[PDB]
Structures are given as C-alpha cells and as structure tokens.
Design an enzyme around this catalytic site. Structure first.
Site, PDB file in Angstrom:
ATOM      1  N   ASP A 170       0.828  -1.217   0.000  1.00 42.11           N
ATOM      2  CA  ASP A 170       0.000   0.000   0.000  1.00 42.11           C
ATOM      3  C   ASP A 170       0.862   1.268   0.000  1.00 42.11           C
ATOM      4  O   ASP A 170       0.523   2.254  -0.657  1.00 42.11           O
ATOM      5  CB  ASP A 170      -0.935   0.029   1.227  1.00 42.11           C
ATOM      6  CG  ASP A 170      -2.319  -0.568   0.972  1.00 42.11           C
ATOM      7  OD1 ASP A 170      -2.524  -1.315  -0.015  1.00 42.11           O
ATOM      8  OD2 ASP A 170      -3.219  -0.289   1.807  1.00 42.11           O
ATOM      9  N   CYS A 212      -2.396   0.697 -13.499  1.00 45.55           N
ATOM     10  CA  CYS A 212      -2.470   0.696 -12.038  1.00 45.55           C
ATOM     11  C   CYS A 212      -3.646   1.592 -11.665  1.00 45.55           C
ATOM     12  O   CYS A 212      -4.695   1.474 -12.290  1.00 45.55           O
ATOM     13  CB  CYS A 212      -1.130   1.101 -11.416  1.00 45.55           C
ATOM     14  SG  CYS A 212      -0.316   2.584 -12.154  1.00 45.55           S
ATOM     15  N   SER A 213      -3.527   2.503 -10.691  1.00 45.80           N
ATOM     16  CA  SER A 213      -4.654   3.412 -10.479  1.00 45.80           C
ATOM     17  C   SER A 213      -4.601   4.608 -11.449  1.00 45.80           C
ATOM     18  O   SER A 213      -5.549   4.836 -12.210  1.00 45.80           O
ATOM     19  CB  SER A 213      -4.700   3.886  -9.018  1.00 45.80           C
ATOM     20  OG  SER A 213      -5.958   4.545  -8.778  1.00 45.80           O
ATOM     21  N   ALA A 214      -3.471   5.325 -11.501  1.00 49.78           N
ATOM     22  CA  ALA A 214      -3.345   6.456 -12.438  1.00 49.78           C
ATOM     23  C   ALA A 214      -2.703   6.074 -13.770  1.00 49.78           C
ATOM     24  O   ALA A 214      -2.794   6.853 -14.732  1.00 49.78           O
ATOM     25  CB  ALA A 214      -2.510   7.593 -11.820  1.00 49.78           C
ATOM     26  N   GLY A 215      -2.086   4.902 -13.859  1.00 48.56           N
ATOM     27  CA  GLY A 215      -1.397   4.490 -15.077  1.00 48.56           C
ATOM     28  C   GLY A 215      -0.067   5.183 -15.374  1.00 48.56           C
ATOM     29  O   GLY A 215       0.322   5.280 -16.554  1.00 48.56           O
ATOM     30  N   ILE A 216       0.663   5.612 -14.348  1.00 47.87           N
ATOM     31  CA  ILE A 216       1.971   6.251 -14.561  1.00 47.87           C
ATOM     32  C   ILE A 216       3.066   5.748 -13.630  1.00 47.87           C
ATOM     33  O   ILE A 216       4.251   5.752 -14.001  1.00 47.87           O
ATOM     34  CB  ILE A 216       1.851   7.797 -14.481  1.00 47.87           C
ATOM     35  CG1 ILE A 216       1.382   8.272 -13.108  1.00 47.87           C
ATOM     36  CG2 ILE A 216       0.938   8.295 -15.586  1.00 47.87           C
ATOM     37  CD1 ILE A 216       1.359   9.806 -12.961  1.00 47.87           C
ATOM     38  N   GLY A 217       2.716   5.315 -12.424  1.00 52.22           N
ATOM     39  CA  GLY A 217       3.730   4.950 -11.448  1.00 52.22           C
ATOM     40  C   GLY A 217       4.230   3.514 -11.504  1.00 52.22           C
ATOM     41  O   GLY A 217       5.308   3.252 -12.062  1.00 52.22           O
ATOM     42  N   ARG A 218       3.485   2.580 -10.888  1.00 50.88           N
ATOM     43  CA  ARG A 218       3.762   1.151 -11.084  1.00 50.88           C
ATOM     44  C   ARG A 218       3.788   0.766 -12.565  1.00 50.88           C
ATOM     45  O   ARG A 218       4.627  -0.036 -12.996  1.00 50.88           O
ATOM     46  CB  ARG A 218       2.706   0.312 -10.342  1.00 50.88           C
ATOM     47  CG  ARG A 218       2.735   0.527  -8.842  1.00 50.88           C
ATOM     48  CD  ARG A 218       1.568  -0.153  -8.163  1.00 50.88           C
ATOM     49  NE  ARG A 218       1.327   0.432  -6.857  1.00 50.88           N
ATOM     50  CZ  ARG A 218       0.357   0.063  -6.013  1.00 50.88           C
ATOM     51  NH1 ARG A 218      -0.505  -0.881  -6.359  1.00 50.88           N
ATOM     52  NH2 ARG A 218       0.249   0.667  -4.826  1.00 50.88           N
ATOM     53  N   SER A 219       2.839   1.285 -13.352  1.00 47.42           N
ATOM     54  CA  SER A 219       2.788   0.983 -14.786  1.00 47.42           C
ATOM     55  C   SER A 219       4.069   1.423 -15.487  1.00 47.42           C
ATOM     56  O   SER A 219       4.561   0.742 -16.394  1.00 47.42           O
ATOM     57  CB  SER A 219       1.582   1.680 -15.433  1.00 47.42           C
ATOM     58  OG  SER A 219       0.316   1.169 -14.997  1.00 47.42           O
ATOM     59  N   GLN A 238       6.619   7.832 -10.359  1.00 45.82           N
ATOM     60  CA  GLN A 238       5.988   8.863  -9.534  1.00 45.82           C
ATOM     61  C   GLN A 238       6.832   9.281  -8.340  1.00 45.82           C
ATOM     62  O   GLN A 238       6.598  10.367  -7.784  1.00 45.82           O
ATOM     63  CB  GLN A 238       4.625   8.378  -9.029  1.00 45.82           C
ATOM     64  CG  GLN A 238       3.493   8.528 -10.038  1.00 45.82           C
ATOM     65  CD  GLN A 238       2.141   8.193  -9.440  1.00 45.82           C
ATOM     66  OE1 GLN A 238       1.864   7.040  -9.148  1.00 45.82           O
ATOM     67  NE2 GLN A 238       1.321   9.212  -9.219  1.00 45.82           N
TER      68      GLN A 238
END
Ligand SMILES: O=C(O)c1ccc(Oc2ccccc2)cc1
Length: 282
Positions: free
Chosen positions: A181, A215-222, A262
């Site tokens: 998390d 992912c949630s925003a599509g920039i960090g984990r993605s 991010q």
C-alpha cells in the site's frame, strides 16, 4: 557508465531525490487538449494525469472517442505498450472496447481494487464463471474461463465476445496482487518473476496488438513495468549492454505519457529490477 556503479554512487550519496527531480525537470510537455474538454471530465480519474493529444488512443466511435490511455512506442526495442488508468464505473465499457479495437492479447494490472481503504479501480472483470458481464454501451460480453491464484499474482483467461459480430478472443489477465500500500517492494524478484510470466505468454509479442497495462493512475507502477521490460530488451539487443542508460530510456518514454515513475523510490526500484534482471538475460 555501468548502471550498477551509477547505483552504488547514487545510493552512497543518497541522491535519489536529486536524480529524480532532474528527470521531472527535463521531461517533455505536450498539449492534452482533448482530455481537458468539459465533455470528458467524467472520463478522468485524476485531474492532473492526462494523455497527450499526439499519442492518445482513440475509440473507434463517432460519438466521443476519448479514453485516458496512451500508446508508448519504443522504436529501437521494437516494443509497444498502452498505458491507461484503472477503469471508472462509467468507463469499463470503453476499456474493453479499446482492448478489442487494438487487438491486444494481454491486460496487466498492478493494483488491488481497494487500497488504503479507498477504491482504486472498478471491477471490470467477472469473478465467477457462471456470472458473465455485458457492457451494453460498447456491445461486448466478457466471461471468466479460468483462474490461477499464486502467492503474489493471479492469472486469468477471459473470453471477450463482440456481440455485434459474435467473434470471440481469449484475453489473458495478469494481476500482480502484492505491491505494498505504501512504498515499493523490498526485493524485485517477485516483480521480476511476474514480468517473465507476462513475456512467456506471448502477450508482448509483435504478433498481437500492444499489451494494456494499468495501475490506479497508469503512470507509477505501470511506468516501472514498461521501463524495466524495455531496458532488459535493449541489454539483450545491443552489442554493448552497458550502453543502456535507464534515465534516457525513461525520458524517451515520457515523450508519450506524462509523469511516468511517480517517486524517487520508484526510480531506485527500477534500477534494482534491471541490474538483477541482467543476470538472467545474459
Ligand atoms: O474484489 C476484487 O476483485 C479483488 C481481487 C483481487 C484482489 O487481490 C488479491 C488477491 C489475493 C491476495 C491478495 C490480494 C483484490 C480485490
């Protein structure tokens, strides 16, 4: 400079936050005018995360062709990816329309539906074989065919039917279920284990449309997923693998979608994942 030495140098000097702000500073900025149109306000999960006009995926419909999704085209590596936000309650039908129209084989999901006690994305796939989903706005049917729950990931085959033509396709759903998390994983082995499974499946191969990753925003984990994959593919390809510069690959990727990677932790984790992935690749 061998990235393994650049890492230790950055690590000992504790300058990850400094490297990262340097990237933020030199990243591309392009217009995102369509994302900002009033008719599209309910199609963006986050006000500050938008696709550039030049690289956005367009829905093949005359009504409104907008979805918060970007095509990342890596020319030397010969790899393409669609990066997108986690679907909203009103965009689940758009999401599966995009998968159909781009001929994608695989969907890669890097978040949990609920994290930190809040919803990070809708339930856009069915949880039981006998309870299929139908998306009336885009005329699609989606059926769960099988599920394969592993300690840190789950694999699912799905069947997508275009109700207008009764064509069907098998879609593979790869769900990384153990990203914490807060922060980043301690080790990259399970992420590394996860990336090779996607690779094996055929989902990344040029014979298919681009893989969809979110992912949630599509920039960090993605961003971490596609940056690690592309860097390892280049170390595979080039005569001089040490000429792979992760910061330069990231800036290249940021020409196609804003904000990739991010946090300075995520940048450091992307390095670790690459150095350890080099060991298998050679
Ligand atoms: O409601 C849902 O669909 C859902 C599905 C899967 C989730 O991830 C996992 C899976 C196994 C262990 C830990 C987390 C979280 C929510």
């Amino acid at each position: 400079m061998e990235m393994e030495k650049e890492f230790e140098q950055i690590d000992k000097s504790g300058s990850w936050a400094a490297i990262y702000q340097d990237i933020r500073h030199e990243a591309s900025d392009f217009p995102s005018r369509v994302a900002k149109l009033p008719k599209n306000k309910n199609r963006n999960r986050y006000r500050d995360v938008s696709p550039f006009d030049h690289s956005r995926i367009k829905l093949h419909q005359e009504d409104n062709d907008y979805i918060n999704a970007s095509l990342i085209k890596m020319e030397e590596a010969q790899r393409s990816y669609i990066l997108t936000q986690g679907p909203l309650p009103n965009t689940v039908g758009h999401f599966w329309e995009m998968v159909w129209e781009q001929k994608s084989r695989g969907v890669v999901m890097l978040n949990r539906v609920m994290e930190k006690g809040s919803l990070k994305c809708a339930q856009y796939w069915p949880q039981k074989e006998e309870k299929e989903m139908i998306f009336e706005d885009t005329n699609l049917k989606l059926t769960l065919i099988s599920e394969d729950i592993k300690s840190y990931y789950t694999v699912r085959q799905l069947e997508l039917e275009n109700l207008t033509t009764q064509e069907t396709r098998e879609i593979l759903h790869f769900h990384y279920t153990t990203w914490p998390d807060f922060g980043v994983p301690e080790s990259p082995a399970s992420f590394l284990n996860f990336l090779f499974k996607v690779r094996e499946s055929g989902s990344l191969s040029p014979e298919h449309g681009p893989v969809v990753v979110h992912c949630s925003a599509g920039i960090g984990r993605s961003g971490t997923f596609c940056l690690a994959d592309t860097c390892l593919l280049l170390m595979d390809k080039r005569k001089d693998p040490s000429s792979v510069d992760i910061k330069k690959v990231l800036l290249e990727m940021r020409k196609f979608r804003m904000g990739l990677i991010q946090t300075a932790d995520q940048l450091r984790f992307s390095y670790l994942a690459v150095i350890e992935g080099a060991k298998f690749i050679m």
